From a paper:
Here, we describe a multi-reservoir, high viscosity extruder as a step towards automation of sample delivery at XFELs. After commissioning the device with lysozyme crystals, we collected time-resolved data using crystals of a membrane-bound, light-driven sodium pump. Static data were also collected from the soluble protein tubulin that was soaked with a series of small molecule drugs. In two commissioning beamtimes at the SwissFEL Alvra endstation, we validated the general performance of the multi-reservoir extruder and determined 13 structures overall.
Second, we utilise the device in a time-resolved serial femtosecond crystallography (TR-SFX) experiment by collecting structural snapshots of the light-driven sodium pump Krokinobacter eikastus rhodopsin 2 (KR2). Xtrapol848 was used to calculate q-weighted difference maps Folight–Fodark and corresponding extrapolated maps from these data. These maps depicted the structural changes 1 μs after retinal photoactivation. C Difference electron density maps (FoLight–FoDark) shown at sigma level of 3.0 depicting the structural changes of and around the retinal 1 μs after photoactivation.
Author numbering: 8 to 271
Amino acid sequence: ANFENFIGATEGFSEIAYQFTSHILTLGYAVMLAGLLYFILTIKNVDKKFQMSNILSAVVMVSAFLLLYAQAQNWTSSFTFNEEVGRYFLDPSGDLFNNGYRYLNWLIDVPMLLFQILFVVSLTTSKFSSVRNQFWFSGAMMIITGYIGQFYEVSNLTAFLVWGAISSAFFFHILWVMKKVINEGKEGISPAGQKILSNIWILFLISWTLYPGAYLMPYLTGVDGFLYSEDGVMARQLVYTIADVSSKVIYGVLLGNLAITLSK
Ligand SMILES: *C\C=C(C)/C=C/C=C(C)/C=C/C1=C(C)CCCC1(C)C
């Protein structure tokens, strides 16, 4: 159904590819647990008016920890070692590699990552509810559309790219609203706070952009290329993990540093 199931059923995964993926996916949820503690223990550092950011971050941590731990458990329990060939192949008796776990974490997270910023920075000419509604509708849509096309990653590479194209449309609209929010939030805050808001915008752009990259990591070097193999799966899962810590944990950390900066 997905690229990881196909490669695991045809050429198979080497011992290092399988060992490396389960390791990156373990490090993935382990830092979410660490992030959950950081946000809980640091709430006393920010004034009451900003604590909504810590709360939102902590709930994202929980969602990330639970679902990413299941994604890892699903990966390891999805392949078995064939001593006769020397590689890990799809196990007909297991439940297969399912991306729905990662895609459900995204759906729960988008509304909270985009909402929490509006609890630290202030808008000027924009309306609070107008920005929030645009963030929730388009953030959900980019995800349900990215999940619809992900079903044809193998079955139909045309629908894979069209759905990913529509999903991107909603994605670039978010970057647009996120840019006005950071421009308005900069007004009336000290130069120190502005610098952090600039770092946040840059981290938001790269981190969220990493996702579509992994969505295409295999079909990047062609239909018979270096990444159209077990290496493309190692790079996709790796890219997801980097974007996962950056867009969820690092992003939330920077917001807290901003809130800390604002109370002076
Ligand atoms: C886990 C938390 C968040 C905010 C995840 C965000 C993920 C993306 C922005 C993914 C975007 C996609 C794009 C742009 C196109 C293909 C489908 C994706 C969902 C991977």
